[PDB]
A paper describes a structure:
The OBV M segment encodes two glycoproteins, Gn and Gc, derived from a single polyprotein precursor, with Gn encoded upstream of Gc. Compared with other bunyaviruses, OBV Gn is relatively small, with an ectodomain of about 200 amino acids (aa), whereas Gc, with an ectodomain of ca. 900 aa long, is about twice the size of its Gc counterparts from other bunyaviruses. Our structural analysis has revealed that this region is composed of two domains: a 27 -kDa α-helical head domain and a stalk that is divided into two identically folded 19 -kDa tandem β-sandwiches. Furthermore, the head domain is well exposed to the environment and is a major target of the humoral adaptive immune system of the OBV mammalian hosts, indicating that the trigonal pyramid of the spike shields the functionally more critical membrane fusion core machinery from the host’s antibody response.
In addition to the variable region of SBV Gc, we determined the crystal structures of the Gc head domains from BUNV (aa 478–721), LACV (aa 477–722) and OROV (aa 482–702) to resolutions ranging between 2.1 Å and 2.9 Å and refined the resulting atomic models to Rfree values between 0.21 and 0.23. The aa sequence identity among the head domains of all the four viruses is low and ranges from 29% (BUNV:LACV) to 17% (SBV:BUNV). Nevertheless, they share a common tertiary structure with RMSD values between 2.0 Å over 232 Cα atoms (BUNV:LACV) and 3.7 Å over 224 Cα atoms (LACV:SBV). The head domains of BUNV, LACV, and OROV contain each a single asparagine-linked carbohydrate chain and although the positions of the respective glycosylation sites along the aa sequences are not conserved, they project from the same face of the domain carrying the two glycan chains in SBV. Nevertheless, the Gc head domains of BUNV and LACV both formed trimeric assemblies involving the same trimerization contacts in the crystals. The buried surface area at the trimer interface amounts to 1422 Å2 and 1430 Å2 on each protomer for BUNV and LACV, respectively. Whereas the atomic details at these interfaces differ between the two viruses, they comprise mainly hydrophilic residues in the region between helices h7 and h11 at the side opposite to the glycosylated surface. The concurrent observation of two very similar trimeric assemblies in two independent crystal structures strongly suggests that the trimers are physiologically relevant. The dissociation of the trimers at low pH is likely triggered by protonation of residue H590 in BUNV and in LACV, which would lead to electrostatic repulsion with positively charged side chains on the neighboring protomer. The head domain forms low-affinity trimers on the viral envelope that are recapitulated in the crystal contacts for BUNV and LACV.
Author numbering:
A (entry chain A), B (entry chain A), C (entry chain A): 474 to 719
Amino acid sequence: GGGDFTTCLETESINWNCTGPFLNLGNCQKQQKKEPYTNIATQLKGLKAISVLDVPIITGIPDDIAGALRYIEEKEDFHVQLTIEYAMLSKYCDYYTQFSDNSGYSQTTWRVYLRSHDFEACILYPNQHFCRCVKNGEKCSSSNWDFANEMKDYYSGKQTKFDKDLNLALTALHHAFRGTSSAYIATMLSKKSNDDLIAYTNKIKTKFPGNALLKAIIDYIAYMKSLPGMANFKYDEFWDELLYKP
Amino acid sequence: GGGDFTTCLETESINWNCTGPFLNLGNCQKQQKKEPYTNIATQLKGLKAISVLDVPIITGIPDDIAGALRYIEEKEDFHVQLTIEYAMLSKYCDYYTQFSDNSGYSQTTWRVYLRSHDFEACILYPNQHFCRCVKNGEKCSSSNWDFANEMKDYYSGKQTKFDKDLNLALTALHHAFRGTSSAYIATMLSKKSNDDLIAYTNKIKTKFPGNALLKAIIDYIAYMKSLPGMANFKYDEFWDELLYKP
Amino acid sequence: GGGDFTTCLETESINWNCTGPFLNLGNCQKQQKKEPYTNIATQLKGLKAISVLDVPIITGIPDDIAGALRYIEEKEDFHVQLTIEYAMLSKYCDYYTQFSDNSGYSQTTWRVYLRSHDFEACILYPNQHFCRCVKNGEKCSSSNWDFANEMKDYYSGKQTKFDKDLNLALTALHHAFRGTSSAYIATMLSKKSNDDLIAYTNKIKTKFPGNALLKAIIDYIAYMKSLPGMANFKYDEFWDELLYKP
Ligand SMILES: *[C@@H]1O[C@H](CO)[C@@H](O[C@@H]2O[C@H](CO)[C@@H](O[C@@H]3O[C@H](CO[C@H]4O[C@H](CO)[C@@H](O)[C@H](O)[C@@H]4O)[C@@H](O)[C@H](O[C@H]4O[C@H](CO)[C@@H](O)[C@H](O)[C@@H]4O)[C@@H]3O)[C@H](O)[C@H]2NC(C)=O)[C@H](O)[C@H]1NC(C)=O
Ligand SMILES: *[C@@H]1O[C@H](CO)[C@@H](O[C@@H]2O[C@H](CO)[C@@H](O[C@@H]3O[C@H](CO[C@H]4O[C@H](CO)[C@@H](O)[C@H](O)[C@@H]4O)[C@@H](O)[C@H](O[C@H]4O[C@H](CO)[C@@H](O)[C@H](O)[C@@H]4O)[C@@H]3O)[C@H](O)[C@H]2NC(C)=O)[C@H](O)[C@H]1NC(C)=O
Ligand SMILES: *[C@@H]1O[C@H](CO)[C@@H](O[C@@H]2O[C@H](CO)[C@@H](O[C@@H]3O[C@H](CO[C@H]4O[C@H](CO)[C@@H](O)[C@H](O)[C@@H]4O)[C@@H](O)[C@H](O[C@H]4O[C@H](CO)[C@@H](O)[C@H](O)[C@@H]4O)[C@@H]3O)[C@H](O)[C@H]2NC(C)=O)[C@H](O)[C@H]1NC(C)=O
């Protein structure tokens, strides 16, 4: 249920087990988070995972996390982006294990996004368990229950609203899993590979079963994908920028 | 219901149609967001909207949005600040159209602010529809109903509490509409032009009718303005820093 | 109920009255917030609070608050860290008085953190008044009522869950009171000085009685400290990095 870094370097096209949360790391002690990127590049070079030519791209990772994620997602090539992300996860080795529960430094951005904005359907049907889970941290264990089909019926003749709400869920997921995960989601979206997209998000939910809000947003994405609005769904255009170069 | 940039340059004093959200833009395709500020300054110069002397102030806009907004609001002169804001809206051409609905990258800051803090009246009367709309995204369509006059009575003999809660609403609005919009609000506040202030916020609510939380905060500001506490209202002093130089 | 800066410089070990919120300041007018750090270092030097050798560490405080807090907490020595924090509070003289009520620029971070994440106990018992206060700003005046002992019973055989939820409360407090306050909390935690820790947080709650969410999180920390899970409590390891050098 994970991918090795060198094995991932051998593969030609991005796949689920070569995205951030599924990369096999190790420990993760206090010391490694202190390590600067020069040391991590030197480690990767000494193991012959990378060559000298690849050391600068690692040493140019900005020291702050927000800048590091922008730097990673700027890359247009699968193996380069993967190498950078792996260096960063070698410094912040708990970046994605933090997603196992309901808090942590790397979760704040996506949670802040999801809870600060509003779904169109939740504004009209705030008693739905999905909405109560997003807004109040309430009823999360039954979040995937569409009471009286209100949500489904609500979206029925409302392509634009379906598009807004599903894009808000996917934008939250983008903020959760920046970098290779988002390049993979972008790839599937651009090809309308809806079944593969749900397969990947379901793998994320299986990876982090202790993360209640994440489970709710993933179930919601699968629900929207089952609705008639999906056939004409128009994803937000920022995704096209996250695609890799031909 | 909007202002043209050059026409705005001709006018002597800031007015509603020469603030950010009311500046007439066009499209707004994928390409223009990629354009650096040197290109946008060159465009404005080629149209003779600005001269060579004005090119550096545009090319000095920092690349990140937070820095660009700080840069804009640092300006002490109406036409300079307007020109900078217009260059930025020429790059992020959807910055203010994002406010048409209930999400988007440019809305996060103000929504995070409004929902992370608390109104004094809502702590004591959390069942008020305004409070349920701010906190739970619930009852937003009846947010401007003061049940049993609880809010009004609550503020009656409480000048300090009225001041805190109205300032929290206005600070959220400041975070929504930085730059020229905030210089305009600052101008009206410093002159106690309460009717003009409400006229402007009501124009914002009319511009963005699909934005439920924004509608609620704007209705709330008009309600507070109708209360006896408004006559002695003391706005937060940061506003005085956003005024233009004499 | 506060500490003087020079008197604090005389003392050998960090104590409650030499942490940020308890440092005695004065006014705090509009002008002082405009003052750059060179001027503040010159003031402190002219009063002979510091010497010329200490001027650079003050002039190197980055201009943005987030960077200033990172700079302060990087210091490994009590008197240095205190001096830096005092310079910063001399510029943003309302940084900690902002905590007297339910909003303000310096409160956003910790409130955003506390409300974006979730307590394990609140996911299962969302009707608890503590959970309603954190999530909905509701029932804050009775937040410290554990209805039917649900919370206590919930943690009874769940050391890991107790650890997660108490660490989330303490991490929120860390985000509220960065710098010397966090070095003091780190010191008490590393020595399992649970009674002193509660004494300090209770002083914070007494300092800011108008801050409803802060009162709730402080009462909650004292409640957890009373439970059998405290004896084997394992604090998050970032705290050990905030300790001062021997
Ligand atoms: C990320 O995760 C994916 C799965 O999600 C992994 O892909 C699997 O990789 C394994 C190992 O290479 C594959 O198993 C091998 O398949 C060979 C046939 O492949 C073709 O046919 C299958 C359908 O039958 C297609 O799915 C596939 O795309 C090809 O078209 C077999 O010949 C192999 O059998 C031989 O080796 C095994 C193992 O030693 C022996 O037990 C056998 O007896 C035999 O000698 C083998 O079964 C598997 O097919 C792949 N699945 C998919 C869906 O593609 C990636 O490897 C993984 N990446 C990383 C970096 O970890
Ligand atoms: C931003 O939005 C404001 C409104 O909110 C616009 O201001 C209006 O601008 C129009 C066009 O210039 C003004 O209309 C003209 O008013 C002239 C008289 O102005 C004085 O009197 C009025 C009261 O009657 C005052 O409000 C005003 O301040 C002045 O004191 C008329 O003489 C004009 O009539 C002539 O031109 C029109 C149009 O071609 C013809 O149809 C007429 O027959 C006649 O020949 C004209 O009506 C309007 O008064 C302004 N309103 C206000 C409230 O000031 C800004 O122009 C706009 N800015 C930008 C950059 O878009
Ligand atoms: C931060 O806050 C702490 C308290 O939380 C202050 O610590 C107190 O400081 C005062 C003033 O120095 C101390 O009062 C003095 O205590 C002396 C005895 O101290 C020993 O014994 C006590 C127990 O009795 C211990 O707590 C202490 O640690 C020592 O082991 C007395 O001899 C003093 O009395 C003399 O002076 C007073 C005042 O002028 C006269 O009225 C007396 O008659 C007598 O002449 C005095 O009482 C107090 O003990 C300290 N408390 C604690 C708990 O340590 C810090 O000073 C303060 N720091 C800053 C920078 O503000």
